[PDB]
């Protein structure tokens, strides 16, 4: 056996490959990207969960050196690791937009990203427009969306309405999207979703030097400090162009601002696996940040 | 548009 079977899962489908026994992360990754027709690769990674902490396939380490569950077939999930500051300008390819659309929609439906009720209905309408094409009362009669996962449970429970009260609302918006192709409807979804507050934010529980539990936020704009009860609005921000360095040692992070008069910010994070993910996310988001502006 | 990761215990220099 010169190869082992790798199962790749995207938001769209699952597929399989033969991974060479000594292939590194970049080898498998490049193969998955060519197969998809995806040239905008900087956004994506290959993910697997072990002990409930997310890990990303390191490009220059052997796939089999990773501690992924090696129960056949070895499985990874193709997912956006980074988000653009503007989807409509940075996502050139249709495959890229479509994968982003599905990953973000899932986030909003699983309530990992907060969405207000009225925007949730508008979001659903573009999703419906994307899946069914133009509205047609002949084909799409009352009840055609009864089995569809369209709204977050929160919005459904917020104001108790029957599915057919929500269908009317989503259908009413649906009818006004007439003429929009799948790719257009999907980009309109992203344009709304990306202005949501929790969009593109990686959250991590941390503690300041006084022992106060807090949330570190890592996104396309920079590092952020949140209160654990408020994931919508960060109390402190450090934009990528305003950080001189980020230091790490023995579970302690030290953010050093560019402004020499601003005091450093220190925090603790207990897990080594999370600390390297944080550092990774820092390097990546900073790189994409500085490239949009080069 | 670049970064440099360096041991000492690691320091992430951002430009």
UniProtKB/Swiss-Prot annotation, chain A:
- Looking at the record, the residues that make up the FERM domain are 4-293
Phenotype upon gene inactivation: Mice are born with abnormally small lenses with serious structural defects. Failure of lens vesicle separation and the resulting changes in cell organization causes lenses to herniate, leading to expulsion of lens fiber cells through a perforation in the cornea. Developing lenses show loss of cell apical-basal polarity, failure of the lens vesicle to separate from the surface ectoderm, failure to properly exit the cell cycle during fiber cell differentiation and incomplete terminal differentiation of fiber cells.
Where is the protein found, in the record's own terms? Cell membrane; Cell projection; Cytoplasm, Cytoskeleton; Nucleus
What is the residue range of the signal peptide feature? none
Question: What kind of modification does the protein receive after translation?
Answer: Ubiquitinated by the CUL4A-RBX1-DDB1-DCAF1/VprBP E3 ubiquitin-protein ligase complex for ubiquitination and subsequent proteasome-dependent degradation.
Q: Per its database record, what is this protein's job?
A: Probable regulator of the Hippo/SWH (Sav/Wts/Hpo) signaling pathway, a signaling pathway that plays a pivotal role in tumor suppression by restricting proliferation and promoting apoptosis. Along with WWC1 can synergistically induce the phosphorylation of LATS1 and LATS2 and can probably function in the regulation of the Hippo/SWH (Sav/Wts/Hpo) signaling pathway. May act as a membrane stabilizing protein. May inhibit PI3 kinase by binding to AGAP2 and impairing its stimulating activity.
Q: How does it assemble?
A: Interacts with NHERF1, HGS and AGAP2. Interacts with SGSM3. Interacts (via FERM domain) with MPP1. Interacts with LAYN. Interacts with WWC1. Interacts with the CUL4A-RBX1-DDB1-VprBP/DCAF1 E3 ubiquitin-protein ligase complex. The unphosphorylated form interacts (via FERM domain) with VPRBP/DCAF1. Interacts (via FERM domain) with NOP53; the interaction is direct. Interacts with SCHIP1; the interaction is direct.
**Name of the protein in question:** Merlin
Give the encoding gene's name: Nf2
Q: Which residues of the full protein are shown?
A: 19 to 312 of 596
Swiss-Prot record, chain B:
Localization recorded for this chain is:
Cytoplasm; Nucleus; Cytoplasm, Cytoskeleton, Microtubule organizing center, Centrosome
Q: What induces it?
A: Up-regulated in a number of cancer cell lines (at protein level).
Tell me which domain of life the UniProt entry assigns to the organism this sequence originates from: Eukaryota
- Cite the record's tissue specificity text: Ubiquitously expressed.
Disulfide pairings: none
Question: Subunit details for this protein?
Answer: Component of the DCX (DDB1-CUL4-X-box) E3 ubiquitin-protein ligase complex, named CUL4A-RBX1-DDB1-DCAF1/VPRBP complex. Interacts with DDB1; the interaction is direct. Also forms a ternary complex with DDA1 and DDB1. Interacts with NF2 (via FERM domain). Component of the EDVP complex, a E3 ligase complex containing DYRK2, EDD/UBR5, DDB1 and DCAF1. Interacts with DYRK2; the interaction is direct. Interacts with RAG1; the interaction is direct. Interacts with LLGL1 and LLGL2. Interacts with histone H3. (Microbial infection) Interacts with HIV-1 virus Vpr protein; the interaction is direct.
Q: What does this protein do?
A: Acts both as a substrate recognition component of E3 ubiquitin-protein ligase complexes and as an atypical serine/threonine-protein kinase, playing key roles in various processes such as cell cycle, telomerase regulation and histone modification. Probable substrate-specific adapter of a DCX (DDB1-CUL4-X-box) E3 ubiquitin-protein ligase complex, named CUL4A-RBX1-DDB1-DCAF1/VPRBP complex, which mediates ubiquitination and proteasome-dependent degradation of proteins such as NF2.
Q: What is known of its domains?
A: The protein kinase-like region mediates the threonine-protein kinase activity.
Protein's name according to its UniProt entry: DDB1- and CUL4-associated factor 1
Q: Which organism does this record belong to?
A: Homo sapiens
